[PDB]
Design an enzyme around this catalytic site. Structure first.
Site, PDB file in Angstrom:
ATOM      1  N   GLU A  63       1.458   2.114  15.390  1.00  4.29           N
ATOM      2  CA  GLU A  63       0.954   2.725  16.613  1.00  4.29           C
ATOM      3  C   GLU A  63       0.749   1.749  17.764  1.00  4.29           C
ATOM      4  O   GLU A  63       0.416   2.199  18.857  1.00  4.29           O
ATOM      5  CB  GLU A  63      -0.406   3.415  16.403  1.00  4.29           C
ATOM      6  CG  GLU A  63      -0.633   4.083  15.108  1.00  4.29           C
ATOM      7  CD  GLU A  63      -1.016   3.131  13.990  1.00  4.29           C
ATOM      8  OE1 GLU A  63      -2.222   2.953  13.729  1.00  4.29           O
ATOM      9  OE2 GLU A  63      -0.104   2.586  13.368  1.00  4.29           O
TER      10      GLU A  63
ATOM     11  N   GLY B  37       1.347  -5.006  11.797  1.00  3.91           N
ATOM     12  CA  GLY B  37       1.236  -4.002  10.746  1.00  3.91           C
ATOM     13  C   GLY B  37       0.854  -2.576  11.151  1.00  3.91           C
ATOM     14  O   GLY B  37       1.042  -1.643  10.372  1.00  3.91           O
TER      15      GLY B  37
ATOM     16  N   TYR C  99      -1.335 -11.223   3.426  1.00  2.00           N
ATOM     17  CA  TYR C  99      -1.469  -9.845   3.923  1.00  2.00           C
ATOM     18  C   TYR C  99      -2.945  -9.605   4.278  1.00  2.00           C
ATOM     19  O   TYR C  99      -3.823  -9.586   3.403  1.00  2.00           O
ATOM     20  CB  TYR C  99      -0.973  -8.880   2.819  1.00  2.00           C
ATOM     21  CG  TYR C  99      -0.886  -7.379   3.165  1.00  2.00           C
ATOM     22  CD1 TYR C  99      -1.086  -6.901   4.477  1.00  2.00           C
ATOM     23  CD2 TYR C  99      -0.615  -6.449   2.173  1.00  2.00           C
ATOM     24  CE1 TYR C  99      -1.026  -5.529   4.765  1.00  2.00           C
ATOM     25  CE2 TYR C  99      -0.545  -5.080   2.449  1.00  2.00           C
ATOM     26  CZ  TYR C  99      -0.754  -4.627   3.737  1.00  2.00           C
ATOM     27  OH  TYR C  99      -0.698  -3.265   3.980  1.00  2.00           O
TER      28      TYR C  99
ATOM     29  N   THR D 183      -2.234  -6.524   9.687  1.00  2.00           N
ATOM     30  CA  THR D 183      -2.501  -5.127   9.903  1.00  2.00           C
ATOM     31  C   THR D 183      -3.913  -5.070  10.464  1.00  2.00           C
ATOM     32  O   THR D 183      -4.897  -4.786   9.776  1.00  2.00           O
ATOM     33  CB  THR D 183      -2.368  -4.298   8.608  1.00  2.00           C
ATOM     34  OG1 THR D 183      -1.003  -4.359   8.163  1.00  2.00           O
ATOM     35  CG2 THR D 183      -2.767  -2.824   8.868  1.00  2.00           C
TER      36      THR D 183
ATOM     37  N   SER E 244       0.844  -1.207   0.000  1.00  2.00           N
ATOM     38  CA  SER E 244       0.000   0.000   0.000  1.00  2.00           C
ATOM     39  C   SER E 244       0.901   1.288   0.000  1.00  2.00           C
ATOM     40  O   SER E 244       0.702   2.222  -0.796  1.00  2.00           O
ATOM     41  CB  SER E 244      -0.902   0.037   1.258  1.00  2.00           C
ATOM     42  OG  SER E 244      -1.582  -1.207   1.484  1.00  2.00           O
ATOM     43  N   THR E 245       1.889   1.272   0.886  1.00  4.99           N
ATOM     44  CA  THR E 245       2.811   2.387   1.091  1.00  4.99           C
ATOM     45  C   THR E 245       3.592   2.741  -0.147  1.00  4.99           C
ATOM     46  O   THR E 245       3.975   3.894  -0.330  1.00  4.99           O
ATOM     47  CB  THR E 245       3.738   2.049   2.251  1.00  4.99           C
ATOM     48  OG1 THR E 245       2.913   1.762   3.375  1.00  4.99           O
ATOM     49  CG2 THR E 245       4.684   3.206   2.593  1.00  4.99           C
TER      50      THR E 245
ATOM     51  N   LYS F 228       1.196 -10.951   7.344  1.00  4.87           N
ATOM     52  CA  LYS F 228       1.310  -9.548   7.725  1.00  4.87           C
ATOM     53  C   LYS F 228      -0.074  -9.197   8.290  1.00  4.87           C
ATOM     54  O   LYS F 228      -1.057  -9.102   7.540  1.00  4.87           O
ATOM     55  CB  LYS F 228       1.624  -8.641   6.521  1.00  4.87           C
ATOM     56  CG  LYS F 228       1.931  -7.228   6.991  1.00  4.87           C
ATOM     57  CD  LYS F 228       1.875  -6.117   5.936  1.00  4.87           C
ATOM     58  CE  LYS F 228       1.943  -4.767   6.722  1.00  4.87           C
ATOM     59  NZ  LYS F 228       1.648  -3.498   5.990  1.00  4.87           N
TER      60      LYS F 228
ATOM     61  N   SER G 286       5.107   1.678   7.516  1.00  2.00           N
ATOM     62  CA  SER G 286       5.366   2.913   6.759  1.00  2.00           C
ATOM     63  C   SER G 286       6.325   3.841   7.487  1.00  2.00           C
ATOM     64  O   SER G 286       7.228   4.399   6.877  1.00  2.00           O
ATOM     65  CB  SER G 286       4.064   3.703   6.553  1.00  2.00           C
ATOM     66  OG  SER G 286       3.113   2.976   5.805  1.00  2.00           O
TER      67      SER G 286
END
Lengths: 291, 291, 291, 291
Positions: C189, C186, C134, C164, C44-45, C162, C205
């Protein structure tokens, strides 16, 4: 002049998952003979998101050769990328379509301002062709409020909204705030209700096999025959219950294959084949619609 | 015989937030004078959830005193608790209501089996009164699939379904599966489209100040005048737009205050007061309704 | 050997939205200099969803030229189309990547079997490279269940996942069920919390500008010093806080541009430019990071 | 001094679904025997929403008599109604509770301002007792934004937040914003991860049958030993998986019964009975915890 009932065109593939031109030409002709007001091409139903840009433009080119002049043609040129969308907008114009349309860019979240610039850019590349803003939360994941809708549809060059949402309170607020706006009901299963709430036409994938019924529903509500409108909608709904169970696009292609319109009813991977157990209901439906 | 247009009754209060018995009788009377077919009492709109079982049973009693025999009466009896629900169900029959109703129990997650037992138990205590299952996903948090709805409406004793859902595909699917089921449209904002979809009546909070409009729509649709129906729905929606901004219950009570019906237009805390800035439109709404 | 902290690589563009190869090389080298374990490229990044296949393959090629043999390299090869994904997996093997990865096909709904067949085919095409499933419900709209994850994660050739997702009950449930699965957290934060739950490492990212902080959180937990681990996570979250407000990719690119790593901080349309009001904070952040 | 691990207290019932006073006290003392810092009473886990106000007050009293002094005591006093909430608040003071608490009022939608006045009123009736705001999106349906949480927890009189959310980025943002605030982790399955993100304590339903494990996690992270914190959370989660399968409240009471604490492991209707097929697992568990 864009108001009306437009089929969201399917894209026929050959055994090798390549465009089957002859079946595409057949499908366009089959729709015309059905009495459809136009075709919406390169949309979700056309499997645009599993197609390359050149493949999508080839399709636009073929149906224009086949339908320009006969019925209305709207080209969905929408991509996540504004630049890819502009390229397709330029082809739609170059080939003679009457309008362009683009789904709200998906996957990545974009602000209302980013969505407006995206539309403005495509509109500029459309060189005159009106824009059909396309709202379809279920697939795109973009939840548009009434206020955001107002902003998008008031953009210069936007002449219509394809509302693929089942919220009929919003359908009528949109109609009330935008009286002159062409409003397409997007979910086939609530068409009659959609028109009553304010839609002035529709675009749908099941119109490829029973477009005549939706035109029938339109005539009925015009002739104040609510009863006939209701019967047509429930016959459509029995077919949709089935298509939803079988896989909508592959299901539609299968009915079309049994009607001799489409050579091979395959969708592209990752879509899988239709479950063997569904073929009898599909074969039956085909028979039933032909008569 | 309970199919029709029923107002979701408001519970009037005084300055100390206690039932204002005299305004209640006035409101019940007002609803009858509009030509409404019945009253759905003790639901979301009667502020049931911020009322004790005894205040709820007391409203049942008074409304029945005021209208038993005059119009149909449905008593909403639901509580998260099966036992409190049963208790109110006994009061309903005891006061001679025509039917009982119960929202799917909320907050805690319950299984389909647990929900059926909940309705069976309440049905048991209603001693013969038919049950109206109540599906309102937006407020209860319980999202019923078509099949869970099938399982609940075919429970012995269940005679109806109050569908407070904007999914009009589900509305016709329910109608197509349960052709004898009484089907009330829950969202006033989509009334006309709701009936078209298969609903054969409606229960709503706004019927309290303009129930005749909804009756006019029922009639217009039966009479095939789709044009007036839409016109009517548009006018209803202009009002609903306002009520949603001002707060629906407090807004309806404020309007009924300008029509004299209600003395004190207060809802119980946590509901706050109407916004002073809103009062001119509400007063003017009342004025024109006096049409 | 695939366990670790990998930066989700950005794709630098020039003023005309074309790939900036010189900045792409700088960024690869910049990340290696930060002591990153590897790179996840074309995800995505990397703005892969607004890039063509040819463009995505070109980036795979340049990054391998710069980093093959230096750090681990994972190629995000996923597209909705299975065929396109296969073409990208073959390029990844051709250029020498250590692994391939593919997001769950989105926009159109697919069954678990359809998803399994997508991964199998891509695995076939990767000719030996293992697969990193993912899962990113927020962007794809596909919220896999622990069960579906188990089926996908057990496919032959799947070496990692992965994750997220912020559901840390599922993270530990996945770790419990697959003790030998490389599990990448993923959401930057919650990195520390994700690791505690069972995450084996992470892909992110923000690793592009402060990968050393993530390496620090790993070491601290490895030394039972939860005190500094929280300190580090807190600093990362103050930065993530800003990035979410400014637009993540463009914010990262702006910081990288201010660090003289990339020539032009633009993202492709429809992403818009960074709001001028945010520049003071991004410049200051860049300053402090450089120290 | 409210920081710490507090068990969310179940309320044992008899075959008649009435309060089993002897079992209540036994459970209270049993939690003490485990080493709990306090008990959270009259909340979700106490089946309070399926209890009358007087029944709730009555529970507060028995627990106080058994504990005002030995451990900390928090009284969940929330109802949808503010007035009912105030009544329980006055009773909380009366039996000398350490703090009060109230879920965000549910079912009806209320504005931030209404939620604010609802908490002020209860704080007021709590006569100085500190308020614990309770955020539990999944049951209440009230999704609070960081900004809304800020407004609520900085209301005068508020001393803590029970965070029943699996969003650990929000947990860390709450901590960074209110470093003085007592922050209870609400989901047992992510306790370790939650304290790491910034929670300083925790309130849970499974604390009743294994409060010691949670206490062990807290110590394990204090002593900087993530290793046993994880192994402990893994054990807690193996158990939580089971309680989810069996039904949580009923699954906990059943375990308590095989542990000879509660007479009859029955929850009130609509909660159903535990599936007979689960008893072996629950006994075997009750057996292992006893050590």
């Amino acid at each position: 002049n864009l108001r009306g009932v437009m089929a969201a065109l399917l894209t026929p593939f050959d055994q090798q998952q390549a465009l089957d031109k002859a079946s595409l030409r057949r499908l366009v002709q089959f729709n015309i003979q059905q009495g459809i007001d136009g075709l919406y091409v390169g949309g979700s139903t056309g499997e645009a998101f599993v197609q390359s840009l050149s493949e999508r433009a080839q399709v636009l080119e073929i149906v224009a050769e086949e339908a320009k002049g006969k019925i209305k043609l709207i080209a969905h040129v929408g991509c996540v990328s504004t630049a890819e969308s502009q390229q397709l907008a330029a082809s739609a114009k170059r080939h003679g379509f009457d309008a362009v349309s683009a789904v709200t860019p998906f996957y990545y979240p974009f602000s209302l301002e980013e969505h407006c610039d995206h539309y403005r850019a495509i509109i500029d590349s459309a060189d005159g062709l009106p824009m059909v803003v396309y709202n379809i939360p279920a697939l795109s994941g973009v939840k548009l409020t009434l206020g955001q809708i107002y902003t998008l549809v008031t953009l210069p060059g936007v002449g219509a909204l394809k509302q693929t949402s089942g919220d009929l309170y919003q359908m009528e607020q949109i109609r009330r705030e935008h009286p002159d706006l062409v409003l397409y009901n997007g979910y086939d299963e609530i068409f009659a209700s959609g028109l009553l709430a304010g839609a002035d036409g529709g675009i749908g994938s099941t119109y490829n096999i029973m477009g005549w019924r939706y035109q029938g529903i339109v005539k009925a509500l015009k002739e104040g025959d609510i009863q006939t409108a209701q019967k047509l909608q429930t016959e459509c709904n029995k077919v949709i219950d089935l298509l939803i169970k079988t896989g909508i696009f592959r299901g539609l292609k299968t009915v079309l294959h049994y009607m001799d319109v489409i050579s091979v009813p395959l969708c592209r991977k990752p879509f899988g084949p239709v479950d063997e157990k569904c073929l009898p209901e599909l074969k039956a439906l085909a028979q039933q619609l032909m008569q």
